[PDB]
From Swiss-Prot, chain B:
Protein's recorded name: Phenylethanolamine N-methyltransferase
Impact noted for substituting residue 75 to A: Significant decrease in protein expression and enzyme activity with octopamine as substrate
Gene that this sequence comes from: PNMT
Pfam families per UniProt: NNMT_PNMT_TEMT (PF01234)
Regulation: Inhibited by methyl methanethiosulfonate, phenylglyoxal, tetranitromethane and diethyl pyrocarbonate. Inhibited by 4-oxo-1,4-dihydro-quinoline-3,7-dicarboxylic acid, 4-(benzo[d][1,3]dioxol-5-ylamino)-4-oxobutanoic acid and 1,4-diaminonaphthalene-2,6-disulfonic acid.
GO BP annotations, alphabetical order: catecholamine biosynthetic process; epinephrine biosynthetic process; methylation
Amino acid sequence: PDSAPGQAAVASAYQRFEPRAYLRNNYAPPRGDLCNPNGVGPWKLRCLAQTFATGEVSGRTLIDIGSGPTVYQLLSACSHFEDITMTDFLEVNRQELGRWLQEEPGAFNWSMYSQHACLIEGKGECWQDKERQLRARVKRVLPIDVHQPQPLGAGSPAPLPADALVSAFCLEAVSPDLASFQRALDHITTLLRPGGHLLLIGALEESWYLAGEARLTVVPVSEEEVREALVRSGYKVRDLRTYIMPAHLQTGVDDVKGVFFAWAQKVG
Amino acid sequence: ASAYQRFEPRAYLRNNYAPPRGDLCNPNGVGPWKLRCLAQTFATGEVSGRTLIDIGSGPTVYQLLSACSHFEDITMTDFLEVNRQELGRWLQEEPGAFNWSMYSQHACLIEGKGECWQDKERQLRARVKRVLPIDVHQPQPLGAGSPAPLPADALVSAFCLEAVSPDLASFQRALDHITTLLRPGGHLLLIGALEESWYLAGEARLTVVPVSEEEVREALVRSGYKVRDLRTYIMPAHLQTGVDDVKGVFFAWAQKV
Ligand SMILES: Nc1ncnc2c1ncn2[C@@H]1O[C@H](CSCC[C@H](N)C(=O)O)[C@@H](O)[C@H]1O
Ligand SMILES: Nc1ncnc2c1ncn2[C@@H]1O[C@H](CSCC[C@H](N)C(=O)O)[C@@H](O)[C@H]1O
Ligand SMILES: Oc1cccc(O)c1
Ligand SMILES: Oc1cccc(O)c1
């Protein structure tokens, strides 16, 4: 039938999305604890650092899809791309990012994440330098809607097509069903050049998460469903790993069972 | 040397461990060079045991960051009470403690074990059992009935001896004194100023004995050490700040025979 109904429920639910609560829920401890090497934060950072460390993912332009109020997903990326586009559906998230870009004190503090990224990249970089570079290389923060065939709109500011895409915890968190998820992946895929790379991180078998007042409906996906959608979109899957959420990190902020990381390269 | 009675801890930490000398971002600065010497030395695995004493800690902890994972019992020392108080403020996470986090981070970075800086800090705090008075001019620097386990398996001392000695001879004697504290076959990590004659600490102006790398070498030998490593950092111009006239910094790894 049609996609409007579910898409409309999603947009409606996000009107209540609270950036600070979401940051607290997922990026403050225990989930944001970077000392525990078995924690989810360290694993996410590690997937990104190792992928970029192959030297196989480079270019001039990078687009981060559904950045929300977070930047950790770009810490290892930023040394490999000189032009970075960050994006989100919600103005309030885009402002949160604005706060970090201006280095305001009222901003969320990512320095543990910056430090940790420096630590595992193994180049002796201080975190203030990593941050300075991320801030310099973010060239724009744009509204985005992945349900649109042109997710950035027509006549986008963004350099297109990009050399690479990053997207963490977006697609499954905004798609009422798997077919919607697939279409979203198809949409963002039009922004990536052939032979370009997508780094996709996401929730496994999740149906809801909390962001303050907002309780959001997530399509629960399996690793295998993630693989097939990537193939369906015209990628070769180069890496797909799974982290199983330990019980102690199951805090009632969501019903997440695990997290996936895909490295995929667009065929062409 | 009652000049040390006017010595202000915060002023000293300010002059030496805040920007520019305390910026650790640039790999060519003195802070990173110092941490590197300590890290690489312990990474060899040849310096180890159970107990370690830090001679003339002042109000600083950076010199034990790499050390702390190799020794379960650590003694810190200084001549000034005010310094011992400043140490205590950091060990006990009290208010207005100096912020060493940048240094903990850099040690974690250099060590390359994937360790978070908070774990590093917690372990150092855990292994420092006591902060004791000391005078290297005394034949028994720690006094007679010290709480400190002796003889130590290892010593560390940074910027103390030359900074408390009017001349080479006094420097040599003080080296003799601290050396009695070290078990035979033990290790000493000595860091110090090269060709320095004064530095400032608030109202205090201290006299320093200017020493050369050769003179440091010979002093260690004279004290019965085998010198396993002696390295020099030349002080770049941008780190010549008005707080002293230091020319360079030396790092020595020495073993008692
Ligand atoms: N239709 C849509 N198209 C693109 N992004 C959307 C969207 N609807 C909601 N979003 C955004 O999807 C995000 C999911 S939270 C993920 C945030 C971040 N990437 C991280 O790694 O933590 C929210 O920021 C939300 O505003
Ligand atoms: N007679 C003495 N015996 C032992 N230490 C002394 C001393 N007189 C002064 N000191 C201490 O020697 C220190 C020199 S500054 C100490 C340097 C510090 N450990 C660092 O690495 O930065 C001061 O803390 C001072 O209080
Ligand atoms: O970072 C996130 C976002 C949404 C669900 C989740 O389990 C984790
Ligand atoms: O850390 C120090 C201590 C004393 C003199 C100096 O130049 C540096």
